[PDB]
């Protein structure tokens, strides 16, 4: 039911907050460095630190700009916050294998 940071246990999100963007909460993507991510979209998340200002470059999600989202506790890269778009205006794309799932 709750997702925590796999490295340190910081409280991050909830299964209840999964968001099906374009029909699926799961999206498999690669960046310009060829890294493949299995990204789960969430309407809401907490315990992150968003670093820098948003960028639209190479955005996986049409009409959204991204900011890097670290674990606010341990600084591990957990995904991205997306903003600037429509319906919803914002959401989080978190890297599923960087989270741990477990009880409330």
Ligand X SMILES: COc1cc(N)ccc1C(=O)N[C@H]1CCC(=O)NC1=O
CB of 92 to ligand X, least distance (A): 12
- The DSSP 8-state label assigned to residue 20 in this structure reads -
Window contacting ligand X (CB under 6 A); options: 5-13, 17-25, 42-50, 59-67: 59-67
Q: How far is CA 36 from CA 33, 50, 59, in A?
A: 9, 21, 14
With binding defined as CB under 6 A, does residue 91 bind ligand X?
no
Nearer residue to ligand X within complex by CB, 12 or 21: 21
- Contact partner at residue 66 from ligand X, Zn ion, none, CB < 5 to 8 Å by partner kind: ligand X
Q: Smallest gap, in angstroms, from Cβ of residue 12 to Zn ion?
A: 8
State the Cα–Cα distance between residues 12 and 99, nearest whole angstrom. 8
Task: Give the list of residues 6+ apart from residue 37 with CB closer than 8 angstroms, or none.
Answer: 28, 29, 30, 31, 79, 95
C-beta of 39: minimal distance to ligand X in Å?
8
Per CB under 6 A, does 31 bind ligand X? yes
CB 63 within 8 A of CB 84: yes
Residue set of the binding site = 5, 8, 24, 26, 71, 74
């Amino acid at each position: 039911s709750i997702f925590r940071c796999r490295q340190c246990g910081q409280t991050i999100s909830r299964r209840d907050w999964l968001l099906p963007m374009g029909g699926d909460h799961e999206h498999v993507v690669f960046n310009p460095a060829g890294m493949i991510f299995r990204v789960w979209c969430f309407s809401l998340a907490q315990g992150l630190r968003l670093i820098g200002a948003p960028s639209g470059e190479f955005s996986w999600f049409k009409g959204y700009d991204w900011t890097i989202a670290l674990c606010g506790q341990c600084g591990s890269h957990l995904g991205w916050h997306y903003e600037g778009g429509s319906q919803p205006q914002t959401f989080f794309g978190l890297i599923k294998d960087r989270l741990a799932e477990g009880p409330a």
